[PDB]
């Protein structure tokens, strides 16, 4: 999270571009349940998370699609 959130501040600077934009979407069942989907903004990309009950989980895995999409 922390480090997910910097190590993409650093390659957003390594590789010139304007810092990573998050954004938060919601899916709502009629009876229950309640699913965030979290996304990623880096160059002109957005990297989304899989879909999760808990915003750090789905904050996260958005991440790991940004450092591992990056990494190749």
Same mark, same amino acid.
């Given at each position: ?6 190590? !993409?501040?650093?390659?957003?600077? %390594? ?5 990573? !934009?998050?954004?938060?979407? %919601?899916?709502?069942? !009629? ?18 998370? /899989? #879909?999760?009950?808990?915003? %750090?989980? #789905?904050?996260?895995? #958005?991440?790991?699609? /940004? ?6």
């Amino acid at each position: 999270h922390g480090l997910c959130k910097n190590l !993409l501040q650093e390659y957003a600077q %390594k590789m010139n571009y304007a810092i990573p !934009l998050y954004q938060c979407q %919601k899916v709502e069942t !009629l009876g229950r349940v309640t699913q965030f989907t979290c996304t990623v903004e880096i160059g002109g990309i957005k990297y989304t998370g /899989a #879909a999760t009950r808990t915003k %750090k989980d #789905a904050e996260i895995s #958005a991440g790991r699609t /940004a450092l591992l999409a990056i990494q190749s």
